[model samples]
Target: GSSGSSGVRSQVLKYMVPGARVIRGLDWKWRDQDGSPQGEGTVTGELHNGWIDVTWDAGGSNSYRMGAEGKFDLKLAPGYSGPSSG
Candidate 1:
């Protein structure tokens, strides 16, 4: 059995909508198994209808969700732009 405040919160990746002027915080970084920098970064992106419109910064546009809601540091590489997962 479980209660309201005692449940595990689902932390799914965020979705970027259209007209989102300047992702403003391309700071989400991560390391690889070998301990090298290899992660997400958004030079600019705008998702409108569940499809790839543009990918700026790291990949220069693609077919996946790539926009963090906020930022913490520059190492996060855009993806680290949100509060720690809880």
Candidate 2:
């Protein structure tokens, strides 16, 4: 089915970042729409090959990715819920 404004996204990440390896100590801040980070999550998941491995921290782990200074990164999008909930 279809409806509503076209620009109204579902607030979900539709794609996974490339070059992500695994998770370590995944801790990030929610962007405050500026250089400031807002919401903080000391928990997430350590996913290997898009799969949540046994490694975890703060009761969870986030994801793997390249850092800044010209690099990629990854995170667990809690939105986009489907069968891929691991």
Candidates' C-alpha lDDT: 0.33, 0.31
Best by TM-score: 1
**Tens digit of lDDT per residue, candidate 1, span 45-66?**
3343332233444444444323
Tens-digit lDDT track for model 2 on 1-86? Answer: 87886563211123332322222223323222212322223222333343332223234343433232222333443442323546
Candidate 2: regions farther than 4 A off: 1-34, 39-72, 82-86
lDDT of 2: 0.31
Per-residue lDDT for 33 in model 1? Answer: 19
Error of 2 at 23 (Å): 13
- After superposition, the stretches of candidate 1 with alpha carbons farther than 4 Å from their true spots are 1-37, 52-59, 65-86
